[PDB]
Every structure is written in C-alpha cells, then in structure tokens.
Design a protein around this ligand. Sequence first.
Ligand SMILES: CC(C)CN(C[C@@H](O)[C@H](Cc1ccccc1)NC(=O)O[C@H]1[C@H]2CO[C@H]3OC[C@@H]1[C@H]3C2)S(=O)(=O)c1ccc2nc(NC3CC3)sc2c1
Lengths: 99, 99
Amino acid sequence: PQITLWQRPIVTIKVGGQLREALIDTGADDTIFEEINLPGRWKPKLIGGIGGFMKVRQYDQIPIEICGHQAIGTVLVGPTPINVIGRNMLTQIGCTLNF
Amino acid sequence: PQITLWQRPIVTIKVGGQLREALIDTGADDTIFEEINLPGRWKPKLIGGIGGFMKVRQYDQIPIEICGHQAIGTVLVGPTPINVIGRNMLTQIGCTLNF
Ligand SMILES: CC(C)CN(C[C@@H](O)[C@H](Cc1ccccc1)NC(=O)O[C@H]1[C@H]2CO[C@H]3OC[C@@H]1[C@H]3C2)S(=O)(=O)c1ccc2nc(NC3CC3)sc2c1
C-alpha cells in the first residue's frame, strides 16, 4: 500500500515461522530482528548505529513475508530496540519513497 | 521525486545557512545532524538507537530545506554516523512509502 509517516511505519511480517511487527526503515541497509529463532548456521557480525555498535548473528537466505509480499535475504538477529526491515528486503518488495 | 532503495536515499539539504547531505530515514522519529552550527538556545537530550544511547543538543523551530522543500522543526545535533532526516520533517514535505 501507500504508507504515510505521521506514525511509525510498522508492518506485520512472518519470518522463521513466527509472526512479528517491524518498522519499514529506509535508513537501514540491513534487516534486524530481536528475539527470533532462526534455523541453521550463522556468522557473528558487529554493526554500527546511533549510540555505537552491537553484536548480531547473521543468517543468510532467510525467507520473509513483509505485509503479504515474499522476499528472501540476510536477516540479522540481535538486541535491537525495534525490529527493522532494511533496504536489502525493501528493494525486493518494490518499496519506494515519494514526495 | 520518487526515490528507489537500491542505494542509500541521500539528499541535499540546507540548514543553518550550511549545506549537508542526509539520509531520508523512515525509521527515525527525529532529525539528527553531526557537526552543524545552529544559533540560539538548546537543551541536552539523550536518544537511543542501535548500540545504545547518545547525547545530543536539541534545537527547536529550525528552518530546513530538504531536496528543495521548505520545513521547520526540531533538529538534534550530535555524533551520529550519518545525518538523518526523520519523520518530524518528512511529514512536512509530503514524503510517503509506496509498495
Ligand atoms: C542510525 C541509522 C543510520 C541506521 N539505523 C536505522 C534507523 O532507522 C534506526 C532504526 C531504530 C529505531 C529505534 C531504535 C533502534 C533503531 N533509527 C534510530 O536509531 O532512531 C533513533 C533516534 C532517532 O529519533 C528516534 O527514532 C528511533 C530512535 C529515536 C532517536 S540502525 O538501526 O542503527 C541500522 C539498521 C540496519 C543496518 N544495517 C547495516 N548494515 C551494515 C552497513 C553494512 S548498519 C545498520 C544500522
């Protein structure tokens, strides 16, 4: 759909067989969830934001459904304050900015 | 214009008489710049992100030009890794998400 920005642009997602809410985040290169349980092998990764860096687990080739749209890609798991859908997934569902 | 997300959605802004580049950031409630010199009174503020909290100066009712569009609002100044235009300004210029 079209989403205005008067409120946080939060959408419902399905990942790893679990349901979560996440922020559509154009300022995020990558996609980050707190407290999901994904299968398989992962790589430790350090990522930087406001306030410094945080350690995450990097999982590759993870299917995700984002407001009804299917995608597959890297998902980072770590102690983010809010789950974020970043550009690596937003490009797959055709998300654009308009003004 | 329309902006796709294959690259970071960086735009040119004018604020405090200075020219900067900034990321259009739908995941940001507020607007944050590193190293700009704004006039007048400010109040200290702590804000949270990935990796923890950071101290910023909060300046209110600051005029800003964002890719040619005029707005006025709160601008935070502090050691962010990249300048971000958040929803407090994006709503003023009519920015929306589309997919
Ligand atoms: C900082 C920004 C440049 C990047 N971020 C995305 C932002 O959209 C972030 C989302 C968020 C919201 C809430 C809490 C935590 C985070 N927003 C934020 O921190 O906003 C803050 C402050 C601003 O106003 C209020 O609104 C929310 C609060 C609050 C005060 S990220 O998460 O660090 C981030 C995300 C993905 C990512 N991928 C990388 N890959 C590597 C490169 C190859 S690096 C990387 C960094």
